[PDB]
């Protein structure tokens, strides 16, 4: 009948969960989101820190603890701490509530990254925004994977759109025409950003430099010269394209 309080039916903890199934029994443990990764990398932080709780779970969502009877039937021991370590080591990461959200984001991130590395619009070699690229990649259709590397996936993505469209999988070379007085500042921004070659400096004449950068970086380059100088800057292509980048196939 009507009670003065709730019946209490919540045991949902929002920390990370590492899953290991053995002997027809799923086993989980409460760890943190960052620490599991660290452990698997080989970086020590004791078992006190990586484990949020030192007792073995059947289900972290339900909050059902594994009995000694069960534990000994799977791992050949009833000591929980030891089991936890084992779970951490050989088991795979399982998404909790927080982690589900992250998962959703992850895909978005990957597409943003992998697709935007190397490309140009059809007809001539010019830079262009990521949204367009994304659209293009959707048209041809691509499914990202966390089991593959991002760099590896980039190549795959470009493969599809090399067949379909005209694109640039390699670097290009630029040529800027800088003044002698106002150009020094500009140069110092550019030098650590990208590789400078063919640097011809004069007093009586204007300063000339050439760059090595990807097809999407031209825009980035040209823009930062204008606002820093406070005048227009002449952008010319030294080459429309040049070898290496994702053309050497890393």
């Amino acid at each position: 009948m009507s009670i003065f309080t709730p019946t209490n039916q919540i045991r949902l903890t929002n920390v990370a969960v590492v899953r290991m199934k053995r002997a027809g029994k799923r086993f989980e443990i409460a760890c943190y989101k960052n620490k599991v990764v660290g452990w698997r990398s080989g970086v020590e932080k004791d078992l006190d820190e990586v484990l949020q709780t030192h007792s073995v779970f059947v289900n972290v969502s339900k909050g059902q603890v594994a009995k000694k009877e069960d534990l000994i039937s799977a791992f050949g021991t009833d000591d929980q701490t030891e089991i936890c370590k084992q779970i951490l080591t050989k088991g795979e990461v399982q998404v909790s509530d927080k982690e589900r959200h992250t998962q959703l984001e992850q895909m978005f991130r990957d597409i943003a990254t992998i697709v935007a590395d190397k490309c140009v619009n059809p007809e001539t070699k010019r830079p262009y925004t990521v949204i367009l690229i994304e659209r293009a990649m959707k048209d041809i259709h691509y499914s990202v994977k966390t089991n593959k590397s991002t760099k590896q996936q980039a190549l795959e993505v470009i493969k599809q759109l090399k067949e379909k469209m005209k694109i640039e999988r390699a670097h290009m070379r630029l040529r800027f025409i800088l003044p002698v007085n106002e150009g020094k500042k500009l140069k110092e921004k550019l030098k650590p950003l990208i590789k400078v070659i063919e640097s011809e400096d004069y007093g009586q004449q204007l300063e000339i430099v050439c760059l090595i950068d990807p097809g999407c970086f031209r825009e980035i380059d040209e823009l930062i010269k204008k606002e820093t100088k406070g005048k227009g800057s002449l952008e010319v292509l030294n080459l429309k394209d040049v070898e290496e980048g994702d053309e050497k196939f890393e």
């Binding site: 045991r11 903890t13 820190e49 709780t53 909050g63």
Partner: protein, 217 residues
């Protein structure tokens, strides 16, 4: 600490609890280094001893200590070199902190976990100082009674409580003053190892001066 606010273990409470055969599970200390600059240098080189004494009786953490020492190590290159510094810290973190964790930090229970067996797992360490304990000694040349003072000032901010700072009247890491030390040196009663004076006795040395007097400063 990183796990908790150091204000949880601000002050010395409970009996001293140390890494032993009765407390083997403790994690390793944050500082495993009690060194700064040229330790090989002789006590006869650097005659100035700038200390830092904790004005409060408190539990000054390992992490805090670590923070302090690097602050001093980042006030070695900006002023002088490494060959004007020396530091044994003079405060190790022997005491170890217990932490009774709770499962339901974000979750829930109707007092299931609780304190039914409340013992705290060892996590962290700490150094138990007093109102006149030295927590950083800097032996140095007499050309730095400003820079090691200001190094130690920086350190002071890393620590809990008020922190006095003092320029000694001794040669650093030695019982003797500067008026007495000098006297000894003049007389040939002084004697040096490497970064520590031995000093030649007259009680142990009744008639055996053929080693002490040979290596006098």
């Amino acid at each position: 600490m990183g796990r908790r606010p150091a204000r949880c273990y601000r002050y010395c409470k409970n009996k001293p609890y140390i890494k032993s055969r009765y407390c083997r599970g403790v994690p390793d200390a944050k500082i495993r280094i009690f060194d700064l600059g040229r330790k090989k240098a002789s006590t006869d080189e650097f005659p100035l001893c700038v200390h830092l004494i904790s004005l409060e009786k408190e539990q000054l953490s390992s992490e805090a200590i670590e923070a302090g020492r690097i602050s001093c190590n980042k006030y070695i290159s900006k002023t002088g070199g490494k060959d004007s510094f020396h530091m044994r810290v003079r405060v190790h973190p022997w005491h170890v902190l217990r932490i009774n964790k709770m499962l339901s930090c974000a979750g829930a229970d109707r007092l299931q976990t609780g304190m039914r067996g409340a013992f705290g797992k060892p996590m962290g360490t700490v150094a138990r100082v007093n109102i006149g304990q030295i927590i950083f000694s800097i032996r140095t040349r007499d050309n730095m009674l400003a820079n090691v003072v200001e190094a130690l000032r920086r350190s002071s901010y890393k620590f809990p409580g008020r922190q006095k700072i003092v320029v000694s009247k001794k040669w650093g890491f030695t019982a003797y003053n500067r008026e007495a030390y000098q006297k000894l040196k003049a007389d040939g009663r002084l004697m040096n190892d490497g970064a520590n004076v031995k000093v030649i006795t007259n009680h142990g040395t009744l008639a055996q001066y053929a080693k002490d007097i040979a290596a006098a400063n």
